[PDB]
Amino acid sequence: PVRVLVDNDPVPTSTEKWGKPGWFERNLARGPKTTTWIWDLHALAHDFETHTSDKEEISRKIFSAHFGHLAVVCVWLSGMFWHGAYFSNFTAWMENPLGLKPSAQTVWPVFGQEILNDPSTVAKGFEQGGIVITSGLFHLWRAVGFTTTGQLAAMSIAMLIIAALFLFAGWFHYHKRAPKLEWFQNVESMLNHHLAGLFGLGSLFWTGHLIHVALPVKAQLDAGIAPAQVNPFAGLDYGLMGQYFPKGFGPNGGLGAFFTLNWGQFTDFLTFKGGLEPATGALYLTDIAHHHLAIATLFIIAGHMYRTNWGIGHSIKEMLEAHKGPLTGEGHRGLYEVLTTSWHAQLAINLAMAGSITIIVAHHMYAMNPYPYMGTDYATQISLFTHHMWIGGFLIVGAGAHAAIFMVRDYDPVTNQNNLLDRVLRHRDAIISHLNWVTLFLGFHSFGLYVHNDTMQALGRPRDMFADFAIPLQPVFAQWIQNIHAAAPGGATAPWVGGTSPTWYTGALSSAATLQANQVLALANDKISISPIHLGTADFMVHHIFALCIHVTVLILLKGVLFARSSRLIPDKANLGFRFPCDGPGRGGTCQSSAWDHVFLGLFWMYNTISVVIFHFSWKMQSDVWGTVDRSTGAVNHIIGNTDVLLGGQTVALSQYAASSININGWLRDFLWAQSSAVINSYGGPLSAYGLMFLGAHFIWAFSLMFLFSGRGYWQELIESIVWAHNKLKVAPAIQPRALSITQGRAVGVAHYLLGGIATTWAFFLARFLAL
Amino acid sequence: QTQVKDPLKLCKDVPAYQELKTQRLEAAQKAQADGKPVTFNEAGTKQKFERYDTAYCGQDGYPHLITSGQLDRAGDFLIPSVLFLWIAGALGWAGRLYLAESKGPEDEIIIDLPKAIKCLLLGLIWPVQAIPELISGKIRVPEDRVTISPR
Amino acid sequence: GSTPLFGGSTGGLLRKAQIEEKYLIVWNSKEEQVFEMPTGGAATMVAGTNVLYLARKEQCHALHRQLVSTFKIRDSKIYRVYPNGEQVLIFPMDGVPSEKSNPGREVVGYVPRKIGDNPNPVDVKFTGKETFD
Amino acid sequence: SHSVKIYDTCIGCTQCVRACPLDVLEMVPWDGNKAGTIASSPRTEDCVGCKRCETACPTDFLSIRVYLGAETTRSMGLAY
Amino acid sequence: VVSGAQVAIAFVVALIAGIAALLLSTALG
Amino acid sequence: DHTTMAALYTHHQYIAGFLMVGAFAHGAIFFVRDYDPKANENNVLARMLEHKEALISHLSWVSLFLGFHTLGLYVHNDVMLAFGRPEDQLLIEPVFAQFVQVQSGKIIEGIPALFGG
Amino acid sequence: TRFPKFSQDLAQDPTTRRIWYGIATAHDFESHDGMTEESLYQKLFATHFGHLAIIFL
Amino acid sequence: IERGAKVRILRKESYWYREVGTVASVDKSEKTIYPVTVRFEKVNYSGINTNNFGVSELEEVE
Ligand code: CLA
Ligand code: CLA
Ligand code: CLA
Ligand SMILES: CC1=C(/C=C/C(C)=C/C=C/C(C)=C/C=C/C=C(C)/C=C/C=C(C)/C=C/C2=C(C)CCCC2(C)C)C(C)(C)CCC1
Ligand code: SF4
Ligand code: SF4
Ligand code: SF4
């Protein structure tokens, strides 16, 4: 049944439509009469379902647009390798990865902006210096075996060829060979090919790069060979492969060991080490190679689960119809019809997973650093954690948006009769009211502890505080999990795992203040890459703040999904659409009752969520983890350094996060006020762009409040008096000026609020960590 | 409170300007020999403080502009004023010329370039046309042809 | 008639439907078929007379709009049910639909002027009389 | 209850009657327009004040006007 | 100083202002 | 007592700000509730409403004219300070206000007493 | 629900809007039920005495 | 007034007050209050470009 149905040249490749913007939708094709038309053109341009009712034509546009997006990413990646090749100090950074700051953007000398080129990036080949980069690209390129800038330039050219291939296939599979609708609905074949081919063979081919490039290049740099002298093809010569890996590439031959199933020879270059290498602060490359080999095997195996054309395998529809019970009615019946006829249902799931995975990437990369010497690049560590936290939060909100769009557009009562979806809608009041309760519980019992502590400290009652120095709230479940994972390598449940992340090893300590140098992982620059991360009262309190912010964001987005079609307020809300401003001032007033407006409100709470997470990460790592070790005393000097809590006055020494983050005044004084001294003093030097971005982002954030707090009826009446003056002087335009629509005014407000707020923290973080 | 009887004098007399002027030239000579290409090189910094020498400085040593209409400081505001009003008036007159010759709203989202360049060229000399339309009342629409709201 | 086949939900009647008023919508169906409840969720109408108790008149009129637009069922009737048990027909009032003009209705809310000829609020100062009279 | 007034500019297009989700409105016969009909508001005690009728009205400035008045259980749209 | 007698006198003056405020506030309602 | 002088200035300017907004609020309430166009036919009050688009569009112009250039000058000076060029700031001398001080007998060197002091 | 006594429109509201709007409209004496011009000025004159007394207290 | 002529609007609550429209239809009947249909170059705030006026609300400019 798995065939390939394709219509040949369905759309002629012509520029006739470029003379008429807005041709694709029936309201816009009548041309502009007001300025509302201009905004309507952009907002509807990728909403392919409003352009036609043909599901096949929508699927063809999506497939071709996906090729265009892949070409955009490959052009972006080609630019990164180009700027690394020609506009960087990568050659000098390779000789000294711990002594020189990476820079791959240099600035032309007009208006005095060459002050942004700094020394401590100036070296040979990069005479003028440039902007210190925090993307971690040099650590990634060195890890996968790049030694010279001439190799980065070839990679820049290769990415432009992949981009031109991807862009051509988008023209091809739209204008020349466009697949039919039943080709897209082959989800069993698609899962088979993406698991075994994309993920499986992608990991297997990457294992081959790791074995034959990344491992021998690292073997030559560990031997002391300078990277200009490193032979990159050394892993393709079996003899030179013999000297680095005597067992795996030996007289007991390499591929001879593979086919005789003598795989124990391969333990030279495939291990189960687990922990970090003490010299680089990074994972072992032989562990990384065995990881990608093991997950390639599992993914290629997973790609044979679904039935396509040879009888064997599972049918997903028959699997879903079998998983039902008394408590859940008809169970998963109809979900196969949902997930193979709704692009929004698939996008809602795939955004929920991609956002959640990106957040897992943020946690796993700081704690299990894959790239040598990146753990001591604190500005890189801060930037990569924060960037992927923001990307993950945005994608999860989009999952809530497209789940709501599914409920408005693609939901059908006939498909979902007493199934899981129908039964969730039939107790949506029970779900939301319990979620309302648990957010109120969490908000009282987490933020109220901070307010309690602020008040107790101000009243002169520090023994009445919730703190490690006072009434403790120990996170005993997380400390238990840390104890399990500390004991597990070498112990009973992982006997041949040689180590794990050093964050677990908190057994054995009751604060980060009492940390010795033998417990931490410091590199040759004496800077701490990673350490045991103590969890105390302050970590108990901030984790329930995290739980509050996530549950409210869930509450807003799930209320938007479950009430997208109807409410007791508006019983036919689905006929108004996904995105409508209100249903008028009646019923008391129905502003922002649409599912779109829940996405709007959910973005602020996502913003609030991720802002607390990255603020927690920044302060906790500076106070409890990162810093310097002294070769005398075995002393750990963290970046901030050990507040004394008075209390009696017999002083008590705690880390600054444990002593001060337990109330809001500590966050205001010791975090926001104290650490802003870098960005507000950055003028006249190379971080002065961060000081400008810090001020400019505050402006944009404040500018957003004009849109969020007002309404368009004011602005339309103001435009009336201004159009009068243009009318009076024969300067009125034919495209009549209108105030922004109610929805757009919300969208403009939240976009500038997010842009200003996020870029403020960006300027704050990068000026803080690139200055100290 | 300390009264400043002399808030402004010539910059070449202010010793906080002589601080700054030598501190900028020394940074420009530092980057000429064994340096980096900078915005203000040694000859660029000489000309910069050649201009600022006959300017008015405060006590900090930085030049201050006088915008009262006084003609020894006509370069401070009055000469940039005429250059602004000519260039901004040109762009305003050109849009007004292009709007009158518009086929419709499609000329506003798809720019008709030989119509736009011609209006932008005709706008360059705008007071040749504007003031003979400004005394005639040809600059304005009569009052009963312009919409208003209730009162 | 009988209730449509529905497993119950949390989006239906509250104590207002016991103490103040609830609403009854009656329609005939020729085919057993699935429709979306205004409370939330899917129900099946029987092949016969269907009666459904709803909390608001707007929920009843929303179902009537769904029964017209999707299933071509025209003859829906809406009753207001009082807690003593009295039913009062409220829709349709005179048997003829509201959109079609009918000789026999009285004009209600008519103001014999265009909207910009309403008097000023200073004219009706210190009275309960409004300017839309 | 809100007041829903109909002014003499009504062209009898019936669009406000079709727009109304509460069946507040209806068409009665008239002589003031070519359609021979005008909107009427007999059941404004069911009016919630949503102003969907005003949105549907095509006449410059509108022939139907909703004045939000005293709030009731019906006009606040309460299911409780 | 403000002696205890003068505090007591002040509360008696305040009580008279209180009943005067009570007279006005009921005449206003 | 510096704290008292700061508190008193700030108290009375915020009170003055609320009183100014409320004056225009009750001016707006007057127009909806009490303004009779017949009894005020063609007087100075009705003539304000008659050219109200001219008033609003010119008030809109002044605020944009002030806002573009004042913000633009602050941003110009901020960029100058960031790039290490504080002598390239736009520092405009307040000579019209210094003129006012000199008429009251302040001795400021380059500013003349017009009527003789 | 007799509060607010100056507005039967608000007093018959069965929701919590009755309480908020009774508070918010309590000093808007012109819009109250049964208000005349003469009784308005007489109520203001005495209300102004009460505000004066608060200033002296 | 007849069909085709350019007319000014005297209806003060109209969007097109003091503007010039084109008569598209004049109702030849009695009993109709606003018989003249005028079409305009500018849409109003609802995207509508026509309305009905009485002759007492129009000024023929042609
Ligand atoms: C794979 C990811 C993905 C894909 C394919 C889509 C696809 C779609 N989305 Mg979804 N969505 C996503 C993720 C995604 N979204 C995410 C992450 C969010 C949370 C933000 C949303 C939230 C969302 C909402 C609320 C809505 C959509 C809508 C849509 C549809 C129309 C898009 C359109 O034409 O807008 C046109 C696009 C633009 C006009 C450009 C957007 C510009 C943004 C707002 C600001 C960019 C500023 C930038 C970040 C910084 C620049 C500053 C600098 C220039 C100085 C299309 C189906 C719309 C819909 O109705 O669906 C049917 C809709 O209302 N999406
Ligand atoms: C043809 C171009 C043009 C002209 C001659 C005018 C003229 C005027 N505007 Mg208007 N304005 C314009 C475009 C224009 N405007 C545009 C595009 C916008 C939207 C941003 C506005 C928004 C606007 C507001 C909010 C206000 C004015 C005001 C005014 C008046 C006072 C001067 C001023 O405040 O400028 C300020 C100008 C702007 C804020 C916009 C400038 C943006 C660019 C530079 C203009 C576009 C140029 C155009 C694309 C050129 C095309 C030519 C080419 C095809 C040949 C003056 C009559 C004010 C007024 O009513 O005073 C009584 C007032 O408050 N304008
Ligand atoms: C810092 C926040 C902020 C800023 C800058 C503004 C700015 C403005 N307000 Mg707003 N306002 C705000 C907050 C703000 N408001 C808030 C919180 C409210 C309550 C809701 C209001 C309520 C309000 C009302 C009720 C009114 C205003 C008006 C104005 C305009 C005043 C005239 C002026 O100064 O022109 C100068 C313009 C500015 C200073 C704006 C910034 C211009 C930027 C810097 C230029 C951008 C250039 C850049 C290169 C382009 C971006 C490209 C990029 C995407 C690549 C100005 C646009 C009034 C108005 O419209 O007057 C005609 C008006 O009536 N505001
Ligand atoms: C809207 C409205 C209103 C309001 C209004 C307002 C609120 C106003 C304001 C206004 C104002 C707020 C004004 C003020 C002004 C002032 C002035 C006018 C002053 C002047 C002065 C002078 C001129 C002086 C002089 C001098 C000097 C300077 C020095 C030397 C000495 C002498 C004395 C000579 C009302 C209620 C009526 C009603 C209607 C509506
Ligand atoms: S205030 Fe705006 S969003 Fe709210 S009901 Fe009125 S028009 Fe709709
Ligand atoms: S306001 Fe709403 S409920 Fe009332 S008549 Fe108009 S459309 Fe019907
Ligand atoms: S009031 Fe408006 S919408 Fe209703 S019939 Fe008359 S013209 Fe049509």
Collapsing DSSP to helix, strand or coil, H24 comes out as strand
Name the phi and psi angles at A8, rounded to 5. Answer: -100, 130
CB contact under 8 A, A417 and C42: yes
3-state secondary structure (DSSP) of residue A522? strand
Rounded to the nearest angstrom, the gap between the alpha carbon of residue H56 and the centroid of all alpha carbons in its chain is: 10
3-state helix, strand, coil in chain B (%, to 5): 55, 5, 40
**Which segments of A are annotated as binding site?**
582, 591, 698, 706, 714-715
- Start-to-end CA distance of chain H, whole Å, equals 11
Q: Which two tokens stand for residue C72?
A: 């071509």
The beta-strand segments (E) located in A601-691 are 627-629, 636-638, 644-645, 652-653
Taking the C-alpha atoms of residue A697 and residue F54, their distance in angstroms, rounded to an integer, is 35
Ligand in nearest proximity to the CA of D35: 7
A397/B54 Cα distance (integer angstroms) = 61
Instruction: Round to the nearest angstrom and report the end-to-end CA distance of chain B.
Output: 53
- Binary contact (F33, C120; C-beta < 8 A): no
Helix (H) / strand (E) containing A158: helix A149-171
- Residue nearest ligand 5's atom 2 by CA: A591
Residues 6+ apart with CB under 8 A from A313: A188, A192, A304, A305, A306, A307
Q: Which residues of A belong to the annotated binding site for [4Fe-4S] cluster?
A: 582, 591
Q: Which among D6, D7, D13 is the best mutation to test ligand 7's pocket, defined by most ligand atoms within 8 Å of the CB? A: D13
Spatial contact of A133 and A37, defined as CB atoms under 8 Å apart: no
Question: What are the pocket residues of ligand 5 if the criterion is a CB atom closer than 6 Å to any ligand atom?
Answer: A 581-582, 584-585, 589-591, 711, 742
Which amino acid makes up residue A23?
A: W
CA geometry: angle A634, A635, A636, nearest 5 deg = 125
Q: How far is CA C97 from CA C29, C74, D54, D63, in A?
A: 19, 10, 20, 21
Look up tokens 């410091």; give the residue.
Answer: A522
Please state the separation of Cα A742 from the chain's center in Å: 30
d(CA A586, CA A572): 15
Q: How many angstroms separate the first and last alpha carbons of chain E?
A: 41
Q: What share of chain A is helix, strand, coil (3-state, %, to 5)?
A: 60, 5, 35
Q: Could you give the dihedral angle defined by the CA atoms of residues A192, A194, A200 and A204, in that order, rounded to the nearest 10 degrees?
A: 130
Tokens of A567: 């409410």
Cα dihedral sign, A530-A532-A537-A542: positive
C87's enclosing H/E stretch is: strand C87-91
Q: Which residues of C touch D25 (CB under 8 A)?
A: 98
| Cis upstream peptide for F86 (omega within 30°) | no
Q: Which helix (H) or strand (E) holds C81?
A: strand C77-81
From C36's Cα to the closest Cα of chain D, the distance in A is 17
Contact A640, A622 (CB under 8 A): yes
How far CA A19 is from CA of A98, A218, A736, in Å, comes to: 56, 56, 21
D46: annotated binding-site residue? Answer: no
Q: Which residues contact A169 (CB under 8 A, 6 or more apart)?
A: A67
The CA distance from F59 to A721, in Å, is: 10
Distance (Å, whole) CA B77 – CA B66: 7
Nearest to B148 by CA among A228, A594, A727: A727
Distance (Å, rounded) from C-alpha A465 to C-alpha A453? 5
* Interface contact G50-E24, CB threshold 8 A: yes
Q: Do chains C and E touch (3 or more CB pairs under 8 A)?
A: no
How far is residue A336 CA from its own chain's centroid?
29
Check whether the bond before G4 is cis (ω within 30° of 0): yes
Strands D3-7, C110-111: pairing kind: parallel
Cβ of A726 below 6 Å from ligand 1: no
Decide: helix, strand or coil at residue D47: coil
Q: Across the strands, what pairs with A21?
A: none
- DSSP category for residue A669: I
Out of A128, A727, A734, name the one closest to residue B102 (CB).
A734
What is the distance of C-alpha A69 from the center of its chain? Answer: 18
* Nearest Cα residue to atom 56 of ligand 2: A726
Tokens (6 digits) for D22: 């509460």
What is the SS3 assignment for A36-51? HHHHHHHHHCCCHHHC
Amino acid at A712: R
Cβ B61–F98 below 8 Å, yes or no? no
Contacts of D56 (CB under 8 A, 6+ apart): D15, D16, D18, D19
CB F26 within 8 A of CB F17: no
Q: Which of B145, B146, B147 best tests the H interface by mutation, with the highest count of H CBs <10 A? A: B147
3-state helix, strand, coil in chain C (%, to 5): 15, 30, 55
Q: Would the CB of A600 count as within 6 Å of ligand 1?
A: no
**Interstrand relation of C77-81 and C87-91 (parallel, antiparallel or unpaired):** antiparallel
Of B116, H44, H48, B110, the C-alpha closest to A31 is B110
The Cα of F31 is separated from the nearest Cα of chain C by a number of Å equal to 9
Parallel, antiparallel, or unpaired for β A521-522 and C42-45? unpaired
Q: Any idea which residue has 């030559």 for tokens?
A: A220
A186 half-sphere exposure, CB direction, 13 A CA radius? 19
Please calculate the CA angle C112-C114-C118 and round it to the nearest 5 degrees: 85
Three-state DSSP state, A578? coil
Asked whether D32 and A570 are in contact (CB, 8 A), the reply is no
Nearest Cα residue to atom 39 of ligand 2? F64
Residues of F near A (CB-CB distance < 8 A)? 52-54, 56-58, 60-61, 78-79, 81-85
The burial of C128, by beta-carbon neighbours within 10 Å (0-12 exposed, 13-18 middle, 19 or more buried), is given as exposed
- List the determination method: cryo-EM
Distance between CA atoms of C56 and C80, rounded to whole angstroms? 9
Pairing between β-strand C22-28 and β-strand A627-629 as defined by DSSP bridges:
unpaired
Resolution (A): 2.0
The CA distance from A661 to A615, in Å, is 11
Start-to-end Cα distance in chain D: 18
Gyration radius of chain H's alpha carbons: 11
Say yes or no: D80 contacts chain A, CB-CB below 8 A.
Answer: yes
Say how far apart CA B11 and CA A463 lie, in whole Å.
62
**What are the tokens at C57?**
């008149």
CA distance H18 to H5: 16
Cα separation of A20 and A15, whole Å?
10
Instruction: Please name the helix (run of DSSP H) or strand (run of DSSP E) that holds residue D66, with its range, or none.
Output: strand D64-67
- What is the C-alpha to C-alpha distance for residues A468 and B140, in angstroms, rounded to an integer? 76
Asked if E17 is an interface residue toward chain G (Cβ–Cβ < 8 A), one would say yes
Give the separation between CA A732 and CA A725, rounded to whole angstroms.
8
Two tokens, residue A168: 């051509």
| A301 and A281 Cβ atoms separated by less than 8 Å | no
Write out the two tokens for A594.
């649409």
Q: Which residues pair with H36 in a beta bridge?
A: H26, H53
> Among E24, E25, E26, which would you mutate to test the G interface (most chain G Cβ atoms within 10 Å of its Cβ)?
E24
The two structure tokens encoding residue A346? 């698939």
> Which residues of chain C lie closer than 8 angstroms to F32, CB-CB?
121
Structure tokens at A245: 């890996």
Could you tell me which of A173, A160, A183 has the C-alpha nearest to residue A13? A173
CB within 8 Å: H18 and B148: yes
Q: How far is CA A276 from CA A23, A269, A520, D25, in A?
A: 58, 16, 12, 76
**How far apart (Å, rounded) are the C-alpha atoms in residues A486 and A504?**
5
Contacts (Cβ under 8 Å, ≥6 apart) of A100: A89, A92, A93, A120, A121, A123
Cβ burial, residue F110 (10 Å; 0-12/13-18/19+):
middle
**CA-angle at A686, arms to A685 and A688, nearest 5°:** 75
| Ramachandran area for residue A334 (φ above 0: left; ψ -120 to 50: alpha; else beta) | left
